[PDB]
Symmetry: D3
Subunit: 338 residues, 6 copies
């Protein structure tokens, strides 16, 4: 039963990962929520990926930018930038990584295994359309690859003739034991973000970690806010002035209300496996309706996080004006949060 205040035609704004197709491979599985599942999304698409301990996410690159939140476990990522500088790191649950457009990279689960959420900067992304190393070489002439590698063709007899995508491997050693020497050195700012290094803005019902370009300098395309709200609390009525919002609910149960313009309003129930979308500058709230902390990510195709809270808007507006607006006494306006 929807609220008495819902009205008009608003698109579906919710899709569960459990309704997504499961590509299962030895060493892990993958599934995605794209604009082919949720057409209200115009900026971002999400992939939920899981790797068994030591399993590879095959070396690859793509036209889109990658933003990743570590759901569980631990993993190692490697990458190379456009100036020939290399990057290597290990991360645990709660951490992020970020590869801007066309930056090649790898992921390998460590002893714990891993599950992570990836966000891609085009709404029509697909994991089955990424540029894979083994696919690339499987479709390059062996004389050409031999000339490139400066070796003889016989050495390349056992190159795969078909991609691996996600495949099993052994847990690697320590970084200092595996890191390869590069005369260009490392990338000047990490492609990774370790989350204890940031402390969250605390509000009444919970906490918010804001990770944008001002916190994570390489993240020039996608930014996010990790929100944790205790039971009975609520993310207050607000909107984002610059961009559509793309949500992934990590844990808990929420009631989400969205008001587009023109008497348009809809309310949805979200839970821990769901992706949601808030249209651009649409006014919305997210209320905890479960007994455990509600954790989710607001993600945006925008290097800068920004939002606007209704309470703040009214607090800075002349009191007689808000009173004439809301048909409530100035005295009662004066007691709203500030």
């Amino acid at each position: 039963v929807p609220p008495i205040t819902d009205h008009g035609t608003v698109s579906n704004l919710r899709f569960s990962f459990s309704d997504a197709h499961m590509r299962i491979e030895e060493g892990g599985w993958t599934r995605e929520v794209t604009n082919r599942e949720l057409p209200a999304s115009h900026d971002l698409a999400g992939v939920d990926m899981c790797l068994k301990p030591g399993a590879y996410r095959e070396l690859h690159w793509h036209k889109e930018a990658e933003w990743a939140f570590m759901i569980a476990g631990n993993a190692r990522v490697t990458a190379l930038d456009a100036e020939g500088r290399s990057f290597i790191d290990d991360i645990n649950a709660g951490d992020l990584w970020n590869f801007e457009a066309g930056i090649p990279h790898s992921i390998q689960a460590l002893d714990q295994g891993c599950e992570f959420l990836l966000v891609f900067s085009e709404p029509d992304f697909s994991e089955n359309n990424t540029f894979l190393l083994t696919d690339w070489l499987a479709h390059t002439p062996k004389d050409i690859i031999a000339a490139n590698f400066k070796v003889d063709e016989s050495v390349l007899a056992n190159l795969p003739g078909k991609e691996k995508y996600i495949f099993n491997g052994e847990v690697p050693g320590p970084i200092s034991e595996v890191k390869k020497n590069n005369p260009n050195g490392d990338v000047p700012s990490p492609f990774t973000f370790h989350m204890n290094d940031l402390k969250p803005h605390e509000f009444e019902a919970g906490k918010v970690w804001i990770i944008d370009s001002k916190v994570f300098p390489v993240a020039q395309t996608i930014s996010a806010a990790i929100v944790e709200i205790q039971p009975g609390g609520m993310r207050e009525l607000h909107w984002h002035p610059k961009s559509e919002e793309w949500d992934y609910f990590v844990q808990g149960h929420a009631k989400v209300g969205v008001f587009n313009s023109a008497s348009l309003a809809r309310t949805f129930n979200f839970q821990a496996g769901d992706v949601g979308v808030i249209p651009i500058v649409a006014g919305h709230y997210i209320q905890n309706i479960g007994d455990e902390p509600l954790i989710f990510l607001e993600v945006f195709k925008n290097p800068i996080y920004s939002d606007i809270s209704l309470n703040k808007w009214l607090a800075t507006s002349p009191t007689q004006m808000v009173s004439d607006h809301l048909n409530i006494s100035p005295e009662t306006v004066e007691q709203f949060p500030k």
Copy 2:
């Protein structure tokens, strides 16, 4: 009777605000010219709005950016930026304001009433599709609103159940009396521009006030030039190398000739209240053909104003080249203004 020099298929570039449907409300009226009326417009849309003394344009926001030229009267504007800092000011005829995308604001006419022109950073804008405070709260559950405001549900019984848009109010007190304290402070650069602060570039036939981001720093999306051309004068043949041009004619009568590419040319007569469009990098002139000084706004979806004049181009081009081009002697080409 068009000039014999006109040729080819050129879109219509003229539309009168008097030919737009007028939304009249208790306390004011509004009418708009968009790509639903002038499809040659690809960047901007115009709104002509009128407020009775003390009347509010309801607290609201939109996805688009706002640029406003004050036609008549006086008014007060309030706003809040993305970092929580507030803004309040009074403006008179000739002044400007600017709200970048998603910045909420209110307008209240003062004792004189006011008429103003608003320009929006999308060609398909509509005043009837704005995000209104009362609409938002009318479509939010009352328990949710109460929890947000941290008050009891009964307090919100007299909340409007329907938008106000433009409604009557009493002329407010002085800012020094009505302003609210904000621990975040004021916005660092005003959302307002007082036009007496600006000196015009003066040429033979008139004056041009140029207001772009180097003059009006918050205006990062839309910039403009106010042009006044005396009787017998002309805006010389020129073009803008980076963007389409959108005109509003304040006063006077003009003959405007536009040359798109490929032997396409069309001539229009404009008068006060007309909206016009010059295609991107199209060559054009604007001649005063009336008894009175001609005043209009050239407005652009571009942070930097720029143009290129024909006479300057020829004066800097080698004389033999201009001579071979125009079949005119070097001596008289040397006679052109520089």
Copy 3:
């Protein structure tokens, strides 16, 4: 007969200037390759132009940005910027010029005649739809032109009533004797790039000059790399992470291999007159299959050049990782170029 490793549906990527329609004029000829010829090109379009000694390319402008490589001969360019500062220079084979959007300019061949390649910042550009001075003036009322020049209309009796486009003239004098005085002075950074000022990056089989905004400051829209590859040489396997690639072969014979995503691969034979396109972030190689040096241009709609080589990528990647990927031992992997 295509290689066994090619697979799938890849668009055509090759189009010959010899297959483009030739507009012949008094004083020169022109032909173009656009997405009306090569729909896989989404960013840029190419124009091949030839001018007889002393011949004019008519004074003109366009919405698009111009990046030009001088194929043969010598020529003079003139231009004017938005701040009223002028530019004039002479250039030889191998030199470049660049006029950003809407910057008006002219070209005149010198004693040798000239042939040059122009690349434009929209894939649907057209040489037959540029903004011509005489086309403009032929479609402006003569009273208006008279007022603009403030001459009497008698002087304008011989204005062309029709474009000239490309017309004959005398080889002009030295810059020092023909240059016109401009109180605003010259442009602060040249619209020209003399290739003798830049040393090539040299690798084993050849050389490449990289010219982008860090080398050629006015070129904020288009960048390029001029590549020369000795017989038996090859441009090593790589991709461009940010942009589509647009190629013009100057001289020689090449075999070009392209790997799009999803096991998509195609091989092409390219020749002296040919235009090619490599899709965004597509992996590719370019092998010289002739006995004369292969010269070509990689051009991009991007102010910064960027690429990533497979050799460097594997070089910076952990050896066990590369070995697990490619089904070859660490020992032979340790033998790849770096």
Copy 4:
């Protein structure tokens, strides 16, 4: 001052031919209203053309189908169908003609001169991009034209090198003196409709002539209704179930009210020479608000005319239903016109 019952954003639906550019030629003039003037039109475009006595509209053809209503004067039209069959006729004020897609034809005014309205089956038509006989031959090699006509090239010496479009001529002789012999014979059904052959449907306030494919068999693409409404009369509330409606107001002053769905309503005043558009299945009324008979054409891109009257709908609806809907007693519902 719009009715208080108007609401919401409705496109502009009115455009006056007097605001369209007038292409004037020796022997006549032309002007058009297309989606470049009235973007709410998605099906049809209008042309208002005037020919001096004996004047030709040049032999031509186009991709679109044209429907013509003769406003004043008399004319002769000729055409050819796809089976090699020819057609020739004379027509007067009030008469129609119809040329399906690609059917070539000519128009020549007779002694009175003529003005006529043409309607075209694409909203983006323009008269300046029609296929002209002289244009065609002016851009065909003269040897090719010579071989085609089986003649030698010097008779083609005075072939126009440029179109004629509208040029002067002598009022031709009688058809029985002028008709050329065609072994394929005449077309089986005339490309013309003489309006005196048609009985009007008579209603309370006026007359309706309905001409669709059941009446005018060749007009398989465009149909129409000529409506005349007496002073004080009204075109009753109705809608057209299958297509958009395109109007030309021949004479009088009208108030036209349009209701799209979702509480969207707009009201316009129309006068002679105005073109209007009613969106698909939109409900509308047309009231005469002048003292002279209101005459206009409702035109549709549809071979069959159809409409549905509100009064008829209510009369055929169960009385308790109409009452339950309108909160009016059965006693009153039984009194509506049926």
Copy 5:
């Protein structure tokens, strides 16, 4: 856990009505599945609507065509065609109705209440964007309505100023005593289809009712197949050569396998509330995986039903060919069903 025989990226093809937002009214409720929920749907949109006894679905029309399947209960429909002929009928569960584009109609539940499925001839339809009688009259001037009904304005004082959409009423009397006298008579063929008049085609695993234009003459836009499959049964491997398929599952549990081209295949699990889509000419099967009979609707935007069965295709094909294809002996090919 998907089958291994699945591969590649196929859009989501399943959406549950229970995940669609519910519009609740006094007397009924509504919910829809469109391409805002199911973007793979390119032809049709679905509405699940339920009415309380005596409740009206308001008199209305829409630009799209309506095809309706009666899920439960009984109801009365009324309509009017383009020739002024009337229609009224009652239907029970399992029956259909059909209103082509713009045909006005009403629905009123009888004593039992009703639930029905509506399918509309555009994928972006919306129940909240329908043309309602009262919405229309609420936005028509009262003087205009007074003239239209030929009554004085005092009678129209109680006209709704706002839509009703779905509202309560009394179960009406028999058609014979409530039917209104229309001098134009009844429509020539009913807008209704009583399913007991049609015998199903029987196959061993179930039954198929095929309803297209040859059986239901007014239904010229949408046709359907009602399929019932016993436990252990299967709708054999087949495709439809001319159209997309739009599915609504009435009862049961199904496993549906879809094979698009190019090794793309996906399998879904369907049940009672679900909507599905089969892309055009895609090969598919539907297996009953429950204990109860599986009942569903295959619906098409196509007046004629068509399919092609794999078994028949192979049976009519030369056995040497089928054997050469499938690597099966001829004798085994000879025992496939035919």
Copy 6:
């Protein structure tokens, strides 16, 4: 060197099959020309296919329609229609076949081998995106297929795990000994057209076979004209009033001149392997400039062939009109061909 009469921007209208990628399979080869090679084509796409004697083109179907011309050799086709009726026939060079949308079919070369041209009813077609029998079953679960065929899964052990597309087989026996029995019988009209059954209309320089739905009833989507032009002859100036033209040149060298509207004209040379495009209603000619007869196919997405010749148009127009048009004498006009 293009004619003096060419002018303006025309798309490229030519592409050679020799420039298309050739997919080689044991037993044959295939290559295609689509809008990824020739973006001016908006209706049709071409495939050039060659099958070794006895080789199969795998059993398949597609969304688009097939119209095919037999270039050389002989072949056998099989198909099944939507009413369960089967078709089988063998054909030789010069014959056609036609399978409407979604009609499944097979091709097998006979003793001679075969090469044929296929034309498809969408411009973005690709042979590598066809629905293949083995692809379908290889991506269908084998339990499902076994239940479908009512066999044991053991039987399905050797089903391919991958498409066959083009594979070798033995040249089959006579139709009467291989045709399978079908209780529904054969299709009422053949999907094949034997060209010896058609007499060509003979004109002066050559012959024309016109094959459309009035000649070839199953061909309701694509029609064609086979044109043979003797040396020194020419296909006269003409245009097609209803559709774009798609050409394939069987034999010879041609000069083709195309006139779009608005002074747009371009001329191309076509030869033995070329595909061409003529825009809709564009006026054009095709002249033989070789020493052998020029044979080509004009193909159209239109069930009815139609064209309009300039000579017929002028012969049927009043002579004074043609004379005033062309500035030619009435007597010289009267000697034009008729």
